[PDB]
Design a protein around this nucleic acid. Structure first.
Ligand SMILES: Nc1ccn([C@H]2C[C@H](O)[C@@H](COP(=O)(O)OP(=O)(O)OP(=O)(O)O)O2)c(=O)n1
Ligand SMILES: [Ca+2]
Ligand SMILES: [Ca+2]
Ligand SMILES: [Ca+2]
Length: 341
DNA sequence: GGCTACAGGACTC
DNA sequence: CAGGAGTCCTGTAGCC
């Protein structure tokens, strides 16, 4: 199998750049304002010009400002990047019917019957890069290898505006030299558990006893890391179908008062139904982020679809359940719909 | 034993 | 100082 992975560079920021070329060359930070106080919120992303100084996704907006006081700060316009992302995806489909759209800016394509070997794949990747450049003026990084995982790993080795190929020989090398934390699916909680049993490399997952690995990180992640180590990982490029749609909002002040929370919960439901488009969910969950940023949720499935009225009524109950089974104050409240008809 | 719901957890965008 | 969003997995309890 020959997988070709596409990942758009500095996406939200680059898009803002395309729409306002004047932003070219300056540090740009795309922000998500929570409305709690001037500047409350987090960074969604920023361009390289702002990332070389430490301003990266996930940090507090106020933190970004002390580092880059004259940087350009823009409010995230999700619908614009989504619309842009679609056009590029509809463009990637011309290169293969076997395509998995993994996120707002990533796509996997199976080009097993479009190229003979890697030299041809490489060329098809250069062609894809240019087509996107011309048609949307967005740069992208292309990763190419024998499976989704190594194709992704390839892309972020060649980020940004790059293209890299990890041949079958490179794969065996990576299995021995690549730090296992750099493997998709391994975050610091898991990395810490791995770099605690001298597992710092994929290869040394084969010498560790199976149940020792399982009991630590779980059966799924263990079989996953082992299949990669043996160079047997073969997940197919599947068409993705949205499984859940939701909305969550930050409240002006923390609270445990139902009537003070209700307005925010109801707005989340209204906006959720709008996004639901014409999908009919059979399950609903009320999700709350607490005082200490922990996440709590309670949900329910119905033998039939949930109407907006049933959503309103059920959401209060679920929220009441959260309030009596947990003593912490709420900071963000929202809903999530799933199990679509 | 193992499958289903449900709630916590981890990861990534 | 901590946004908004979505997917997959696990331990538990109920059940056949
Ligand atoms: N914490 C995050 C992570 C991701 N995203 C978004 C906006 C990013 O532009 C888009 C792509 O995420 P990446 O992790 O790929 O970051 P960038 O594409 O912005 O930078 P890079 O060149 O490293 O791919 O996803 C976000 O809003 N908040
Ligand atoms: Ca990515
Ligand atoms: Ca990207
Ligand atoms: Ca990592």
């Amino acid at each position: 199998m020959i997988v070709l992975f596409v990942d758009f560079d500095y996406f939200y920021a680059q898009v803002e750049e395309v729409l306002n070329p004047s932003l070219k060359g300056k540090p740009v930070v795309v922000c998500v304002f929570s409305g709690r106080f001037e500047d409350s919120g987090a960074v969604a992303t920023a361009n390289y010009e702002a990332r070389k100084f430490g301003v990266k996704a996930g940090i507090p907006i106020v933190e970004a400002k002390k580092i880059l006081p004259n940087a350009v700060y823009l409010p995230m316009r999700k619908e614009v990047y989504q619309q842009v992302s679609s056009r590029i995806m509809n463009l990637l489909r011309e290169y293969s019917e076997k395509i998995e759209i993994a996120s707002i800016d990533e796509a996997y394509l199976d080009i097993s019957d479009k190229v003979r070997d890697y030299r041809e794949a490489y060329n098809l990747g250069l062609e894809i890069k240019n087509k996107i450049l011309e048609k949307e003026k967005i740069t992208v990084t292309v990763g190419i290898s024998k499976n989704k995982v190594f194709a992704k790993i390839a892309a972020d080795m060649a980020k940004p505006n790059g293209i890299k190929v990890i041949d079958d020989e490179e794969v065996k090398r990576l299995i021995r030299e690549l730090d296992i934390a750099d493997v998709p699916g391994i975050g610091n909680i898991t990395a810490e558990k791995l770099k605690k049993l001298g597992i710092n490399k994929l290869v040394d997952t084969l010498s560790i006893e199976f149940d020792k690995l399982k009991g630590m990180i779980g059966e799924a992640k263990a079989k996953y890391l082992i299949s990669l180590a043996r160079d047997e990982y073969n997940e197919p490029i599947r068409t993705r179908v949205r499984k859940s749609i939701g909305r969550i909002v930050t409240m002006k002040r923390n609270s445990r008062n139902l009537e003070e929370i209700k307005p925010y919960l109801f707005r989340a439901i209204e906006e959720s139904y709008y996004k639901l488009d014409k999908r009919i969910p059979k399950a609903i969950h009320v999700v709350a982020v607490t005082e200490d940023l922990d996440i709590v949720s309670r949900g329910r499935t119905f033998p039939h679809g949930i109407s907006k009225e049933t959503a309103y009524s059920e959401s209060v109950k679920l929220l009441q359940k959260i309030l009596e089974e947990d003593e912490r104050k709420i900071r963000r409240i929202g809903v999530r719909f799933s199990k679509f008809i």
